[PDB]
Amino acid sequence: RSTTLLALLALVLLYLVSGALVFRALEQPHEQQAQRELGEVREKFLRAHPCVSDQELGLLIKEVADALGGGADPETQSSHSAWDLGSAFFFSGTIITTIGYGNVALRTDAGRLFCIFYALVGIPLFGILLAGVGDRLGSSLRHGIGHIEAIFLKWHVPPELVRVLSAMLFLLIGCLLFVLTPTFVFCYMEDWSKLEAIYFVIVTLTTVGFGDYVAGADPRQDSPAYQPLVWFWILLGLAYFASVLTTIGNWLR
Amino acid sequence: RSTTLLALLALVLLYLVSGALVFRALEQPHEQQAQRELGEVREKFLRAHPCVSDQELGLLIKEVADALGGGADPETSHSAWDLGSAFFFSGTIITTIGYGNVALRTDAGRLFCIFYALVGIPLFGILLAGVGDRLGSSLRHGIGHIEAIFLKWHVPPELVRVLSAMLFLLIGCLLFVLTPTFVFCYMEDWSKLEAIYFVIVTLTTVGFGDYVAGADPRQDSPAYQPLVWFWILLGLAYFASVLTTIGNWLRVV
Amino acid sequence: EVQLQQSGPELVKPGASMKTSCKVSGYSFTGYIMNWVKQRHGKNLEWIGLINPNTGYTTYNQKFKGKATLTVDKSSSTAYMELLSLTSEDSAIYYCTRGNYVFDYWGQGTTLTVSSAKTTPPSVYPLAPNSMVTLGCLVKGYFPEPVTVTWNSGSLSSGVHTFPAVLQSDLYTLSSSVTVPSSSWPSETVTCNVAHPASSTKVDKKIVPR
Amino acid sequence: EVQLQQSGPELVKPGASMKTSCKVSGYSFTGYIMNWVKQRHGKNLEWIGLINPNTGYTTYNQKFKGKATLTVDKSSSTAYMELLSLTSEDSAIYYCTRGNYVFDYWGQGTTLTVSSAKTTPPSVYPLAPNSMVTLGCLVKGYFPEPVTVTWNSGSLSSGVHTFPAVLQSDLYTLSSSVTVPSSSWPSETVTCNVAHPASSTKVDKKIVPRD
Amino acid sequence: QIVLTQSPAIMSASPGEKVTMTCSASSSVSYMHWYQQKSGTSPKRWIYDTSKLASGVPARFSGSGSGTSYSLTISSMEAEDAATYYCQQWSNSPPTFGAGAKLELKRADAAPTVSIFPPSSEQLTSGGASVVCFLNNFYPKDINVKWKIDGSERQNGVLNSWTDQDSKDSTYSMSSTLTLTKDEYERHNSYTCEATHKTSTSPIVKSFNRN
Amino acid sequence: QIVLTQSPAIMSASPGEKVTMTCSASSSVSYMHWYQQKSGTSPKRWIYDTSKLASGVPARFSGSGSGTSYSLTISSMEAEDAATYYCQQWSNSPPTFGAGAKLELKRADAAPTVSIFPPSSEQLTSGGASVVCFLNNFYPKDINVKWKIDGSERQNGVLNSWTDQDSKDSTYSMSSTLTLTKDEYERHNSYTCEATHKTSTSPIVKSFNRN
Ligand SMILES: [Ca+2]
Ligand SMILES: [Ca+2]
Ligand SMILES: [K+]
Ligand SMILES: [K+]
Ligand SMILES: [K+]
Ligand SMILES: [K+]
Ligand SMILES: [K+]
């Protein structure tokens, strides 16, 4: 409906500008501080090393920044592998789910080229499996609800409200299993805070996949089964995120 | 069918393991390049500046890393949380693209981001469907004029439908895949392959973040930065169609 | 005692170029960054660029990108600056100074004069006209700077001002005043002694009353 | 001419500490990193740590973290190393050397001896028994190094080997050989002269044929 | 291309007075440095890193500031403090300087001692004619000269020259030189030099007749 | 932390011969540096950054390598090249050294001249008894000594001492010293020193009887 499309565009547009105002308010001051700190570091180094021009230190920093940005670690000078079989498996998962954390980048043109076709073919294939699991997971949940629903109907609560209460329990348990349970898991496993863990969970299940937080990515952890197994969760949670939203949409329509 | 979905699970699993093997083969031999480059930078600097110990250069590099990680930028106007960049960042959320080339540093930022997305993504999906229908209308209508020609040439109405669908995507591809890649090549000084890589990683909403176009405006070319936003919107809407049909193709197979 | 010793004043034709130097002593040349600075007469200081004598690295003020080339000789711990295609705008005092954040030691400066003029000796003219009397010497049409003016071979040192030279159609002019008790002149003679080293000119002029 | 001039040998009791120096000339002290290195007798070189004379910054080998303190005096362009709680294993030669990636100039080294022993003069014992004949001097139970051994006041200097000292229960022993034509001995007297500067001991021993 | 503004560019102080000169930056800056320059000689590091005094500098000088606003202060003016002071920054390459602040000594006002001089006969024979006026030992520096030929004003072929503040009496002096051709000179008879200084409301006027 | 292995630790070359010594690293480094040390004196930077020669160093020396494997080569041995060579690395802090490779001059084989000496009467009176054996001017350096008392072998109370390669004849020498108490000594009669060297299949044996 042409009128509504334009209204909607204007609304979103306002949702973005509103977002922008808030993120700037919440993040710019931290960033402006960091910029200051970098310059303090420079000025301190110059004062201690007279053999160094500001401009030469500038180049060093640009060069260091590029390397760190390519995943170099400041701490060491040089064992664990980011592209071991388990991490590459995981990486592939991040594509077809469209999550795309990106905490480890492809460096080769072949890697990029292959990645294109891998995704084009992989994502729709996955979407199909997701719809499938969404229907099957909802079915199993709906069947399980039925037995407890029998109890509510005997207690003479109207069938219209019993349907509503069951939804509350339906999502609350899903939430419990796919939102709450994982966040508590990750808190203990990753040494994140509760807030960091929920942040991660939700960034993940929305498929936003920022990449600031990634479960299992930590180098020190001796945890082989961990990272693919987390993918097991991702599968189950995403489909439920999906299926529920779909049924809600149908109910609205 | 439950039996069939179990089969689908196993297929996917194989699609992932197969991916893993290939990425490991293509990328493992270059895991360590960035370290090597950082160390080369260090060693070069020590040789040029005898007033500097390796260990002192070490601390500098740690301190620089901390600052960059807070959002500092090597300088020789670059705010990621000024109004325009925060606008863009909000876009990367509701689209679910999630480049993540700029991280949130505050717990408030993260908290707000959760609710921003939960509300923002479905809202955007709605607008996308809307634009998808309206864009497809415009395309199919234009193609309908070309169809008139085929029908006069007594080409069967069934093939004419097919020629139009191929046209439908082929013309979109030209406008939303090919055109942008050629644009970005010249504008970002990327290679053709880097540009297509970017385009596709973007329109799939994978959003790795290794390549990002539109975060900041370009002096001497004002139309650039908005056109990219406009592009992402229209292209994502187009790409929806592409993805649904590759899906139908796969179901048929 | 750190010291930067610059080479002496230089005089060159418009269009030519020019190379000037700064030898350092009292510290190690290669340990510190060297800068050059321009001061056109009695006005703002302008950073030209720097060189790292150890690495050869140079950066320049955009204003001076094409104009100035910095180089060093490590063995003789000496820094050089070349200026190119010189115009009048380049006439100034130039300093070498040391530092990478503050400029902590400076050379004594070197004056560049860009001009078509030829070495000319001055014409010296007396200036003759209460308890005090003032007399003067007009010294005009000389090139280049400097001249010096004394009075009665230095016996008159109080009461004396020599005014700064000024350019008059490509040559310099100044005058010198001396004030004396009127009992002293013309009862006693007063003569100004003018020297122009560049032309090997030494002239005495007796002030005689009108 | 760059030069790092280290201070002289030092002898200290177990438990004590010791401070030794390295004065640089021929370049500017504050422009270069200074390191110290340990060589226990005729063995691997060991990096102790570094100091940046300009900034005061120090880093140490884990082995030496507690043991060694590096300091500098900028005005006198001199570097110092203190060693603490000295034990016998600290006895070695120590070098100051310059550099932040290769060690391009070294001091001449300084020898540290750690020991409970007291200054003791040596016992000197003659060693008496072909055209050539070999005689010797056994020099034992002295502290500290060095001793000097000559033969006939140094007029007999070819044909002579003095072997390196060795430690036997906190004291040194060595011997010296001299080989001469048998026409010369015992027709001619042979005496080995032994000096031990530390005890102001000078001893002459005539080699006499076994009765 | 950070810009530093020192305003005012000129100031004056009696001895004993407190003096403060400021430097404002176009954008924020972590440290400010100051140079002192006396005419004749190169600049000297005076204060660096905002508030540290260079070796020579007496304690009556101090510095402070932060971000975008910095200042140099003299607790109690002295005579040798008369100079030009410059601020400079290097928190961003390229380093930049303020345009300087010239600090002169205040003293009691003084009227110019004025003298006019007719062309020497020597000069006239060669065909030139320079008429000279000395305005000597006045304070303050603001002054205006007017030339008059036969009562009417002339402002062509006039050249002026000011001395620096005198080192002992803190006055200023200037010359004014009307240069004519012998032709122009011989055409008129009365030549007057006219000085306007704040010490008197009525000009000081010295004249002479060519006769 | 990075370990450098130089193997073998000893080698020998005739003059004119080509010589290659290697340094293998526990994990990769970007550059290797080498020092030359002659006994008595500090190490000298010889080769640095893998293949650059220090000032003094003659062209017959060269260096090469990469990653984990590095080498120093002499195209044509000379006499003044006899020394100990050390590699070192500083691609990772802390810097570390190889344990050195000693390069000696080759020469024609020489048998030891062997001499045994009974305890002096002077020593005996103070209750000790040292029996000494000199094995003099042999090559190569590998040699074995065996002590026998009344035909029965003894290894305890024995101390050995080797000279450095002689700077003129390129031989080696050693002492061996059996130290007993007077008691033990006087209990037996026959004392034999027995030397095994490459230059003969059959030991060289010097003996004496206490009477
Ligand atoms: Ca921005
Ligand atoms: Ca010149
Ligand atoms: K990154
Ligand atoms: K994504
Ligand atoms: K992403
Ligand atoms: K997505
Ligand atoms: K990402």
Identical fold, F1-107 and F108-210 = yes
C-alpha to C-alpha distance for C151 and C179, rounded to whole angstroms: 11
For D171-209, b/e burial (b = at least 16 CB within 10 A) is bbbbbbbbbbeeeebeeeebbbbbbbebbebebebebee
- DSSP-assigned beta bridge partners for residue F179: F130
Where in the sequence is the domain holding A94, given as residue range(s)? 1-253
Say which of B39, B54, B58 has its CB closest to residue F30. Answer: B39
Stated as kind and residue range, the H or E segment containing A233 is helix A226-252
Burial class for D107, CB neighbours closer than 10 Å (0-12, 13-18, 19+): buried
Q: Touching C: which chains, 3+ CB pairs < 8 A?
A: A, B, D, E
Whether D69 contacts D85, CB under 8 Å: no
For B86-107, b/e burial (b = at least 16 CB within 10 A) is bbbbbbbbbbbbbbbbbbbbee
Residue C100 main-chain phi, psi, to 5 deg: -125, 0
C-alpha to C-alpha distance for F29 and F67, rounded to whole angstroms: 5
For C111-139, b/e burial (b = at least 16 CB within 10 A) is bbbbbebeebbbbbbbbbbeeebbbbbbb
**Nearest alpha-carbon partner for F79 in F23, F19, F139, F8:** F19
Whether E192 contacts E207, CB under 8 Å: yes
C-alpha to C-alpha distance for E72 and E81, rounded to whole angstroms: 12
Which residues of chain D neighbour F175 with C-beta distances below 8 Å? 163, 175, 177
User: Residue F70: how many CB atoms within 10 A of its CB?
Assistant: 27
Whether D35 contacts D48, CB under 8 Å: yes
What is the assigned CATH class of domain E1-107?
mainly beta
| CA A131 remoteness from chain centre | 20
For B156-190, b/e burial (b = at least 16 CB within 10 A) is eeeebeebbeebbbeebeeebbeebbebbbeeeeb
C-alpha to C-alpha distance for A178 and A137, rounded to whole angstroms: 12
Q: Which DSSP string do the residues of B8-27 spell out, in sequence order?
A: HHHHHHHHHHHHHHHHHHHH
Side-chain-facing half-sphere of B35: CA atoms under 13 Å: 13
C-alpha to C-alpha distance for A15 and A12, rounded to whole angstroms: 5
Tokens, residue F154: 């003894």
**Number of domains present in the structure of chain B:** 1
Tokens, residue F193: 């020193």
Whether E156 contacts E165, CB under 8 Å: no
Which residues touch C162 (CB under 8 Å, ≥6 apart)? C149, C174, C175, C176, C177
Domain boundaries, chain F: 1-107, 108-210
Whether C49 contacts C57, CB under 8 Å: no
C-alpha to C-alpha distance for B198 and D45, rounded to whole angstroms: 54
Q: Which DSSP string do the residues of F8-34 spell out, in sequence order?
A: SSEEEE-TT--EEEEEEESS--S--EE
Residue A236 main-chain phi, psi, to 5 deg: -65, -45
Whether C24 contacts C84, CB under 8 Å: no
Burial class for D211, CB neighbours closer than 10 Å (0-12, 13-18, 19+): exposed
Distances (CA, A) of A197 to A173, A208, A219, A222, B103: 19, 15, 18, 20, 15
Query: What separation in Å is there between the alpha carbon of A99 and the centre of ligand 4?
Result: 4
Residues A102, B2: C-beta atoms closer than 8 Å: no
Query: What separation in Å is there between the alpha carbon of C38 and the centre of ligand 2?
Result: 17
Q: Which residue has the tokens 């000893």?
A: F10
CATH number at E108-210: 2.60.40.10
Task: For residue B212, give the ligand nearest its CA.
Answer: 7
How wide is the angle at C-alpha E193 spanned by C-alphas E192 and E195, nearest 5°?
140
Which residues of chain A neighbour B73 with C-beta distances below 8 Å? 35
List, as ranges, residues 142-171 from A with C-beta within 8 Å of B. none
Stated as kind and residue range, the H or E segment containing E210 is none
Q: Where are the beta strands (DSSP E) in D89-196?
A: 92-98, 105-106, 110-114, 123-127, 132-142, 148-151, 160-162, 166-168, 171-181, 190-196
Resolution, given in Å to one decimal, reads: 2.8
* The dihedral sign for the CA sequence B55, B60, B64, B66: positive
List, as ranges, residues 41-60 from D with C-beta within 8 Å of F. 42-47, 59
Whether B78 contacts B104, CB under 8 Å: no
C-alpha to C-alpha distance for D36 and B206, rounded to whole angstroms: 55
For C10-28, b/e burial (b = at least 16 CB within 10 A) is bbbeeeeebebbbbbeebb
Nearest chain F Cα distance for residue B210, angstroms: 29
Residues E159, C173: C-beta atoms closer than 8 Å: yes
What value does the CA radius of gyration of chain A take, rounded to a whole number of Å? 24
Tokens, residue F210: 């206490």
Tokens, residue C157: 């040192």
Residue E156 main-chain phi, psi, to 5 deg: -130, 135
Method: X-ray
Tokens, residue B94: 């509701």
For E28-62, b/e burial (b = at least 16 CB within 10 A) is ebbbbbbbbbeeeebbbbbbbebeebbeebeeebe
Say which of E99, E123, E163 has its CB closest to residue C161. Answer: E163
Q: Residue F22 carries which side chain, given as an amino acid letter?
A: T
Nearest chain A Cα distance for residue F28, angstroms: 8
Task: For residue C10, give the ligand nearest its CA.
Answer: 2
Beta strand pairing call for F128-138 and F172-181 = antiparallel
User: Residue F156: how many CB atoms within 10 A of its CB?
Assistant: 8
Say which of D105, D107, D161 has its CB closest to residue F173. Answer: D161
Q: Which residue has the tokens 């016992």?
A: D123
Q: For residue D26, what is the nearest residue in chain C, using CA coordinates?
A: C28
What value does the CA radius of gyration of chain D take, rounded to a whole number of Å? 22
Nearest chain C Cα distance for residue A44, angstroms: 10
Residue A158 main-chain phi, psi, to 5 deg: -55, 145
Tokens, residue A70: 């390519």
Which of A9, A22, A51, A210 best tests the B interface by mutation, with the highest count of B CBs <10 A?
A210
- DSSP-assigned beta bridge partners for residue C24: C4
Whether A231 contacts A90, CB under 8 Å: yes
| CA C1 remoteness from chain centre | 25
Whether D148 contacts D195, CB under 8 Å: yes
The CATH number given to whatever domain includes residue B120 is: 1.10.287.70
Whether C160 contacts C177, CB under 8 Å: yes
Q: Which DSSP string do the residues of B152-184 spell out, in sequence order?
A: HTT--HHHHHHHHHHHHHHHHIIIIIIHHHHHH
| CA F121 remoteness from chain centre | 34
Helix ranges (H only) for E4-152 are 121-125
**Nearest alpha-carbon partner for F111 in F36, F175, F173:** F173
Whether D190 contacts D151, CB under 8 Å: yes
Could you give all domains of chain D from N- to C-terminal order, each with its CATH number?
1-116 (2.60.40.10), 117-211 (2.60.40.10)
Ligand-binding annotation for B97, yes or no, is yes
Which residues of chain B neighbour C54 with C-beta distances below 8 Å? 48-50
C-alpha to C-alpha distance for C75 and C52, rounded to whole angstroms: 14
Stated as kind and residue range, the H or E segment containing E62 is strand E61-66
Nearest chain E Cα distance for residue C7, angstroms: 14
Which of C102, C140, C145, C169 best tests the E interface by mutation, with the highest count of E CBs <10 A?
C102
